[PDB]
Amino acid sequence: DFKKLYEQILAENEKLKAQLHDTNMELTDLKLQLEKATQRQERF
Amino acid sequence: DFKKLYEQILAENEKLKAQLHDTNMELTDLKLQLEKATQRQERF
């Protein structure tokens, strides 16, 4: 009856790991386009 | 013990909810300014 609570939140938690990574890949495309569009900030 | 079972995954699910939201807003920042032909951003 609690085995399912584990399954529900963990299924979502996995998805949250994947969707963040997906939104990070867009953000990484955008920092790449940044340093191509301009000089960009040189923190690293 | 199952009360912690919920809280362990759900606290991580919370963390994931927060950081994704930040990556969404800063992606919308990065996207907006980028194509506007930006120089620098603050993000965080």
Query: Rg of chain A's alpha carbons, rounded to an integer?
Result: 18
CB A40 within 8 A of CB B43: no
Q: Which residues of chain B neighbour A40 with C-beta distances below 8 Å?
A: 39-40
Residue numbers in B near A38 (CB within 8 A): 37-39
Answer for the pair B44, A41: CB distance below 8 angstroms, yes or no.
no
Tokens 């920042």 label which residue?
A: B29
Handedness of CA A29, A32, A34, A37 (dihedral sign): negative
Assess B23–A contact: CB distance below 8 Å, yes or no.
yes
The technique by which this structure was obtained is NMR
Give SS3 for A37.
helix
Return d(Cα B17, Cα A25) in angstroms, integer.
17
Q: How far is A1 from chain B (nearest CA, A)?
A: 10
HSE (CB half, 13 Å, CA atoms) of B44? 3
| Cβ(B16)–Cβ(A17) below 8 Å | yes
